[PDB]
UniProtKB/Swiss-Prot annotation, chain B:
One of its GO terms (biological process) is apoptotic process. SMART domains: GLECT. N-acetyl-alpha-neuraminyl-(2->3)-beta-D-galactosyl-(1->4)-beta-D-glucose binds at N44, H60, R64, N73, R75, W81, E84. This is Anti-tumor lectin. Keywords: Apoptosis, Hydrolase, Lectin, Nuclease. Gene3D superfamilies: 2.60.120.200. Residues 13-156 form the Galectin domain. It comes from the Eukaryota. SUPFAM superfamilies: Concanavalin A-like lectins/glucanases. One of its GO terms (molecular function) is polysaccharide binding. Anti-tumor lectin with DNase activity. Inhibits the growth of several tumor cell lines in vitro. Induces lymphocyte infiltration and necrosis of tumor cells in a mouse tumor model. Induces apoptosis in HeLa cells. Binds N-acetylneuraminyl lactose (N-acetyl-alpha-neuraminyl-(2->3)-beta-D-galactosyl-(1->4)-beta-D-glucose). Coiled coil: none annotated.
Amino acid sequence: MQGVNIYNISAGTSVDLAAPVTTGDIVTFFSSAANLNAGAGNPNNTTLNLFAENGAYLLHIAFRLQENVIIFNSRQPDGPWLVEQRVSDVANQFAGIDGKAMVTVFDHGDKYQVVINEKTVIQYTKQISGLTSSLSYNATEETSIFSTVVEAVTYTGLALEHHHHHH
Amino acid sequence: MQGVNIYNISAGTSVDLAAPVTTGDIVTFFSSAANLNAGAGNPNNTTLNLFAENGAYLLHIAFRLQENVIIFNSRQPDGPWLVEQRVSDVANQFAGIDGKAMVTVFDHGDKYQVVINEKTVIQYTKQISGLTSSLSYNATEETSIFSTVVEAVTYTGLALEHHHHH
């Protein structure tokens, strides 16, 4: 059935989900800060990640202020990064809301829809499929664009289809 | 198309949704406070409402500390409250999380599923159906169990239609 799970992810840590995220499900990362003028990334200021059971990066979201771009990518645990998708201008994606921020990922089965606050920034066609079993928020205490602790809320068991048959 | 909408609702006000909440959709109210010792309501400490286009109260959630209960009901704007549903032990529902809280409502079509933080408090069978076009959060400054401003986040356009051709 439908359920809500809340996790508090501190910068540089990861967490296993009590209920996995699958097709039709949603996860939102809430930040109590929006530091768009933070220190220099190395090159990442912040990364948000959805991992499969084997450690594969189902979705890697990297926020780079200096390069001024958000990178979306995937890869297997022992493999090379795959084909990256870029969204230029980090500040612009968060425009409208300051002092806080939220990033939402919808798992649509074939694609991951990422929304920054109320703006959909990409319809990321998946490069690797499967259930998300863990999440992570990685950054340093001096250059993250988000608060020290990011609250992740997952809405699972959602899948609702309406079958129409034609012959 | 699926989308996320964010609304800051001050106590004692309502907001019209940019995208309606229908079957399969979600709405969550976030509070930066959890004042479970705010005193007696008048009679409500806090209420959260989902309104239909015509003003009907599709779902009315009322928290009463002095009664140690959470009430769920519906009504037409010019009509009386209908059959009241109650859930006792307000504290137990918010147990586990302090200093903040979140209330999630799932629209299942024939029922509204309400979740406080991670706990499902009630599977409310609807007494009035339809789409939710607006929301409201009412309370006084000194006795609300939530923060002066509540942030409502809606996830809409979630249900999908699957066509099969044979």
